[PDB]
Every structure is written in C-alpha cells, then in structure tokens.
Design a protein around this ligand. Structure first.
Ligand SMILES: Nc1ncnc2c1ncn2[C@@H]1O[C@H](C[C@@H](N)CC[C@H](N)C(=O)O)[C@@H](O)[C@H]1O
Length: 340
C-alpha cells in the first residue's frame, strides 16, 4: 500500500478541498448562474448585478471555471454555465442553488463544520459555538432560516403525513400531546381523521405561530390548541397519546432521554407514546455528520430507540414501518406504554 500520484490529486482536488465547496456556495448565494442566463456575460457586468468586488469576483470565477462550473471569458468569449453549472440555476428541480445558499439554514449550518474537531472531542454540536444559539432556537428567532430549512424537507409537502396517519387507529384517542410538533402536519392529519380528538402542540415561538395558522386553515382551531414551551421543561398538559414526530433524531442519546422522561411524565396511565421517525453509503453518513454537527442528533435504528425508551420507563407495545410515495424514506411508528 503506497499512495499513488492519482491518490494525491484526489485528496487535494476533492476529499480535503475546502476552498471549492465554499466557492460553490458563494456562487449560488450571489445567483451567479441565473445572472449569466439573463444576459449578463461581461465580468464587470456580473460584478455590478452582484455588488461584488470586480477583481475578487474575477478570481472566484477563474477557480469556478477550472472546476467545471463555468466556462468562457477567455481574456474574449462570453461567460456562461457548464452543463454541470446549470444545477445552480434557481429553477432546476434538484434545488442545489438553494441547498448551497448561505442565506439558507443548511449552508449557514454547514459553516459550523469548522468546529468539527470539538464535535468529535465532546460529541456536542458546533452550531451554538458559531452563531450564539442552538440550531432550533436560532431558526425559531429567524423566519428566513426556518422557511428555507423547511423548503428543502419532504415532510413540508402537502400530503407528507397521510401514510403514517393511516398507519394508526385514532378512533378511540381523546387527546394528543404533540411534543415539538413543528408546524402541525401530523396533528392536522390526525384531527382530520378523528373529528372528536383534542390536540395540544408544544413548540418554540417560531413554529408555534405557524402551527396556529395551519390549524385555523384546516378548521381545527376549536379543538387543537398551540402552546409555546421548552420540552426539556415539564410539559403543559397530560394526554392518552403523546407524539414525538421527527424529534428524537435531532438529539444525542442523553438529550433524547430527558425529552422522553418529560413525555412519560405527561403520559396519562393506560396511554401510548408514539415515536414517528426514521452513492448509497455516502449520503447517509453525510446526513449523519450534519445531524451531529448542527444539533447533536443521529438516526437511530429500531432497537436503539427501544432501549432509550425502556431506559425511561417504557416498554415496546408494537411497531410498524412502511413506504410512502411522497416520502423519500421509510417512516417508523414505535408504540410504547409505561412499564410501571
Ligand atoms: N428546546 C426545545 N423545546 C421545544 N421544542 C424544540 C426545542 N428544540 C427544538 N424544538 C422543536 O422541535 C422540532 C423538531 C423538527 N424536526 C420538527 C418535528 C415535527 N414534529 C415534525 O413533524 O416534523 C422543531 O420544529 C423545533 O421547533
């Protein structure tokens, strides 16, 4: 085993290359590709429509040219995107211009990776060290960050919760406590399936406001209420159902437990807690480190949740996973009761 010359090329140009991904983000953020397709082609022209330094922009563009994002501007051809560079046009269905946009939650959070040494040393996320507050607290205070994070998640689409709402039986359920319920998708899909069931949703100010709007829109304001609150604090009410929909994954093993201990605390006896959650190899570890770095969470396998649950006074009553046509992953509902 002796590293070849091609091996070094791959480390410098890709695996260890921090300069290029940052160049790609600045290019998407200044809407460079869009500005080129709309008739901009001179360099001085492009710098004007981006409020950038002409010379510094020239140098970013030289590097983007070299990596095959742009082409032209010989020095006397017209500047334009490559086949590859059309991925950064606003309308392209893969939405990479938005994924890379530094005004957006994910790229903003991607910057926190400069503190990855400490994330590995302590196992704590780096987001707070960079921006002053933890991921979800920052999103809640900043509507631009919240809406751009949601725009990129498939749980945001109009019928993302239909399949998992069909999975379970809400005809006997009286009251759902939706802990960190976001902007209300699951609970609205439940309330609609079960006309007599009451809802209570607990969220930070940001999603709280948005969920009130969803519940008014759907005609559920009368029986579904929204409550600002910290789910690390004792929960506002009790219920015969307590739902954690895509919450546990946002948190370490330890924080997941203290959230769960708060939920068991709010669970009315005889009641159930449900946990809705859940090339090839690469995209899953990429998402794994993003989860770790942004908010100290992780995707837990079925067994790994059962033991955090059991470690807080909960026994598995049942499970079910299943495909959804609108979801690009399989969802999982874990039903728990109190052992005690
Ligand atoms: N300390 C906290 N207290 C209460 N809610 C929080 C806290 N930290 C994060 N959250 C919220 O929990 C949510 C987690 C999200 N993955 C949304 C889950 C949502 N239940 C869904 O159906 O997708 C965010 O919307 C946050 O606003």
């Amino acid at each position: 085993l002796e590293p070849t010359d091609q091996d070094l090329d791959v480390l410098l140009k890709n695996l260890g290359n921090l300069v290029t991904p940052m160049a790609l983000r600045v290019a998407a953020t200044l809407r460079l590709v869009d500005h080129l397709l709309a008739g901009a082609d001179t360099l001085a022209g492009l710098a004007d429509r981006t409020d950038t330094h002409p010379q510094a922009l020239s140098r970013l563009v030289r590097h983007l040219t070299v990596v095959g994002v742009l082409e032209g501007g010989e020095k006397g051809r017209p500047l334009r995107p490559t086949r590859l560079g059309m991925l950064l046009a606003d309308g392209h269905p893969a939405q990479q211009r938005a994924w890379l946009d530094l005004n957006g939650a994910v790229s903003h959070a991607d910057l926190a990776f400069t503190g990855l040494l400490d994330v590995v040393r302590t196992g704590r996320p780096a987001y707070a060290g960079r921006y002053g507050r933890p991921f979800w607290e920052d999103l809640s205070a900043d509507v631009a960050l919240a809406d751009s994070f949601d725009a990129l998640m498939s749980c945001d689409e109009d019928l993302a919760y239909e399949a998992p709402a069909d999975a379970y039986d809400w005809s006997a359920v009286r009251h759902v406590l939706d802990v960190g319920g976001g902007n209300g998708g699951m609970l609205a899909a439940i309330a609609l399936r079960a006309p007599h069931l009451r809802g209570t949703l607990v969220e930070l100010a940001g999603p709280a406001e948005r969920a009130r709007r969803r519940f008014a829109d759907a005609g559920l304001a009368d029986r579904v209420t929204v409550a600002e609150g910290d789910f690390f604090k004792p929960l506002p009410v009790t219920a015969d159902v307590v739902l954690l929909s895509f919450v546990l994954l946002n948190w370490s093993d330890e924080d997941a437990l203290t959230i769960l201990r708060g939920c068991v605390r709010a669970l009315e006896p005889g009641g159930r807690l449900l946990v809705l959650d859940r090339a090839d190899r690469f995209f899953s570890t990429l998402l794994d480190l993003r989860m770790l770095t942004f908010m100290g969470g992780r995707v837990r396998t079925r067994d790994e949740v059962v033991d955090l649950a059991g470690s807080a006074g909960l026994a598995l009553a049942s499970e079910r996973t299943s495909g959804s046509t609108t979801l690009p992953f399989d969802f999982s509902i874990l039903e728990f009761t109190a052992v005690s």
